[PDB]
Design a protein around this ligand. Structure first.
Ligand code: DMD
Ligand code: DMD
Lengths: 347, 347
C-alpha cells in the first residue's frame, strides 16, 4: 500500500557517513580538496541500499513516456505523434538517452505510462489511458489512477535492486510535458506561472503568453493543494511526471540513489519530496536545465547541479551524463592511497 | 624552434564544423536541445588532428611536477617534500589524478620538470633545476630555460599522437604553486593580487595577507611584461606552470583538444593564449576551481566550465573528470538516429 511504502523509506545512516568522512579526510590530498566529489561520496555512503560505502553496481535509466491532453491548447510545436515515434526509437538505441546511457554503461528501461497510440512492442506497459486529461479544463487523471501508478512504478523500480541495480536515473518523454511541469513547479514553489514557464522544445517566443495563460488556467480550474503532492500530480501533472515521482519513491524505499535529469524531473522531485520528505537524501542532481523555471525549482529543492550543459532534452540523457561522476566519487573513495602510509602530516 | 612551432599551429577547420553543425541539427531531438554537448561536438570537429569529426581515441593526462623557491616565503602549509612524495605516489596509482584517469580510461604521464629532490625512478625526467628561483626576490628561471622547456614538453605532447592519443588533460603538482599562478593571473588580467590570491592547499585565513604581499613583491621586483607570456612565465611562473603551457602548445600544434583542470592550469592557459592566440580553440575547460581567482582567470579566457565540483586539487584530476563529457559529445554525434529517417518534421 502506498502508506506502507512512504512510512518505510529508511533514514540515511549517520554512522556509515561518519566512517566515510573520516576515510576521505585521510586520503592523499589536502582535506576538502576534492570538494563536492567528497560530499557526494558521503551522501552515497549514507544510503542503506549501498551497504555502508559509496559504490555503483548496475545502472538503470527509467524513461517514462506519455501524452498530454493539454497539447490541444497550442503549448507545443512538436507533433503529438513524436511521443510514440520516439518511444519506439528507444527500442532501437537511437535516442539521446539510449546513446548516453550506453556510454555510461547503464541500461534503459522504457515505460509507457499513457502514450496516445497503440502499444509499442518491447516497451514496458503501465498505460493509464491514451494520453492524460487536458489540465486546462479539468484534471490530468483521478487520484486513484495517480496512486496506482506511483505504487506500480515504485515496485518495478525497487525490484531492479534484485538484479544488481544500485544507481537509477529518471527521465520523461511526452509532447507538451513542460506545461504540467511548469504548473507543478508554480504550485509547489508559489511562483506565478510567468516566472517558470519556459520554451520547452523550441516554442516560438511569441507563443509564450498563451502557454503562461494555459498554466494559470490549469491551476485556477483544478485548485491543486500544494501540501498534497499526489493531489497536485493528479490535477495538473501528467502520467509521465507521476511515473518519475514513482521512480524516486521506489529508489528511496530501496535506500538507493537516483539521478535527476532536467526541468521535467525537477517537477516530479518537488512532488516526491512533498509526499515524503525522506526521499530527499536519495536524490542527486545531474545538470542545470536551460528551461526558464530551472533555477526556481532547484532552489526549492536546495539543489546545485554538477553539470552546466544548457541542456533541455530530458528523456534521461542528463541523468545518464552524470553517472560517471557518481562512479568517480566511488573510485576516489576506494582507490586513493592514504596520508599516513606516505608519512604526510598536515596541520 | 619555438618560432616554427608557434607559426605552424593550424587554424580550426570551418568546413568540418559546418558539416558537423548540419549533422547535429538533423539528429533525433529538438534542434539545440543538447546544448553545450552540441557546441563541444562542433568545436572538436574543427580540430584538424581529429580528422573532421568529433572523436576520442587514446587519452593522456600530463602531470607536470616541480618545486618552487617561493615556498620559503611562508605561502604554503604543505611540507615542501610532499611534491616528491606525491610524484612517487603517481607511479603507484594512488593519487587523485591516477584514480580518476583510470576511471576515465586515460593514461597518466608524470613529468618531473624541477622537483627539489633526487630523481624518481619511473617518472619522465625533464628537470630544469632542483626547484625554481624564489619569485619574491628574482625570477623563477631564465628565458632560455622557459623556452627550452616549452619546446621539449610540446614535442613530447605532440609525439603522443603517434601512439594513438587524441585527447589530452593537463595538471601540475608542486607545493606553493598557487602563488606563481596567482602572480601570472594578476599580470595577464590586470587584477590586483588581492582579487586573485586564494587559500591553495588550506592556507589559514590569517596568512592570506602575507601571500598577497608575496605576489605583489614578485611582480614589483620582476616587472614581467604582460604582452610577452614567456617573459611572465620565466619571471613569476614556475617550471610546472611552464610545463602545462608546453602541453597546450603541443596539443594545439598537433591540432588536438586539451582539457584544463583548475586554477594552476588557468594560469598556464592564459600564458599559452598570450604567446599564441591560435591555441585557444583547442582548449576545453573541465571544472570551475574553488580557488578565489578562478572567476577572473576564466573570464579572461571567455571560458565557462562544464563541472561545478568546488574542486581545488589539480594534479589533473579535474581534467580526467571531464573526459567522459568529451566522449559523450562524440557518442551523441555518431550514435544518435536522424529526424528524416523517422519522418519527423519540426517547424
Ligand atoms: C597530499 C597532497 C597531495 C597533493 N596533490 C596536489 N597537491 C597536493 C598537496 C598535498 C598536501
Ligand atoms: C525529436 C524529439 C525528441 C525528443 N525527446 C524528448 N523530447 C523530444 C521532442 C522531439 C521533437
Amino acid at each position: 500500500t502506498l502508506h506502507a511504502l512512504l512510512r518505510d523509506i529508511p533514514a540515511p545512516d549517520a554512522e556509515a557517513m561518519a566512517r566515510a568522512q573520516q576515510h576521505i579526510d585521510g586520503l592523499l590530498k589536502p582535506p576538502g580538496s576534492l570538494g563536492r566529489l567528497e560530499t557526494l561520496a558521503v551522501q552515497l555512503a549514507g544510503m542503506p541500499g549501498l551497504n555502508g560505502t559509496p559504490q555503483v553496481g548496475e545502472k538503470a535509466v527509467l524513461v517514462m513516456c506519455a501524452d498530454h491532453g493539454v497539447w490541444d491548447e497550442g503549448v507545443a510545436v512538436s507533433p503529438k505523434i513524436v511521443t510514440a515515434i520516439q518511444a519506439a526509437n528507444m527500442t532501437r538505441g537511437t535516442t539521446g538517452v539510449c546513446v548516453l546511457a550506453a556510454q555510461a554503461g547503464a541500461k534503459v528501461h522504457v515505460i509507457d505510462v499513457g502514450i496516445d497510440a497503440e502499444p509499442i512492442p518491447g516497451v514496458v506497459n503501465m498505460r493509464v489511458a491514451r494520453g492524460c486529461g487536458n489540465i486546462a479544463v479539468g484534471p490530468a487523471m483521478s487520484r486513484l489512477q495517480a496512486e496506482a501508478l506511483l505504487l506500480e512504478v515504485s515496485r518495478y523500480t525497487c525490484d531492479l535492486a534484485q538484479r544488481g541495480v544500485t544507481l537509477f536515473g529518471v527521465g520523461a518523454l511526452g509532447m507538451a510535458n513542460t506545461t504540467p511541469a511548469a504548473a507543478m513547479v508554480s504550485v509547489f514553489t508559489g511562483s506565478d506561472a510567468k516566472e517558470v514557464v519556459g520554451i520547452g522544445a523550441n516554442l516560438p517566443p511569441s507563443r509564450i503568453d498563451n502557454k503562461v495563460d494555459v498554466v494559470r488556467r490549469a491551476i485556477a480550474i483544478n485548485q491543486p493543494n500544494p501540501r498534497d503532492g499526489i493531489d497536485v500530480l493528479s490535477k495538473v501533472g501528467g502520467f509521465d511526471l507521476v511515473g518519475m515521482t514513482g521512480v524516486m519513491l521506489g529508489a528511496a524505499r530501496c535506500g538507493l540513489p537516483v539521478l535527476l535529469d532536467g526541468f521535467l524531473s525537477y517537477s516530479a522531485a518537488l512532488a516526491a519530496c512533498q509526499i515524503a520528505p525522506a526521499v530527499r537524501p536519495y536524490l542527486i542532481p545531474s545538470h542545470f536545465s536551460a528551461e526558464k523555471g530551472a533555477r526556481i525549482a532547484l532552489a526549492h529543492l536546495s539543489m546545485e547541479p554538477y553539470l552546466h550543459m544548457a541542456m533541455r532534452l530530458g528523456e534521461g540523457s542528463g541523468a545518464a551524463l552524470a553517472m560517471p561522476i557518481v562512479e568517480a566519487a566511488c573510485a576516489m573513495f576506494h582507490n586513493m592511497g592514504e596520508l599516513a602510509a606516505s608519512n604526510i602530516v598536515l596541520p
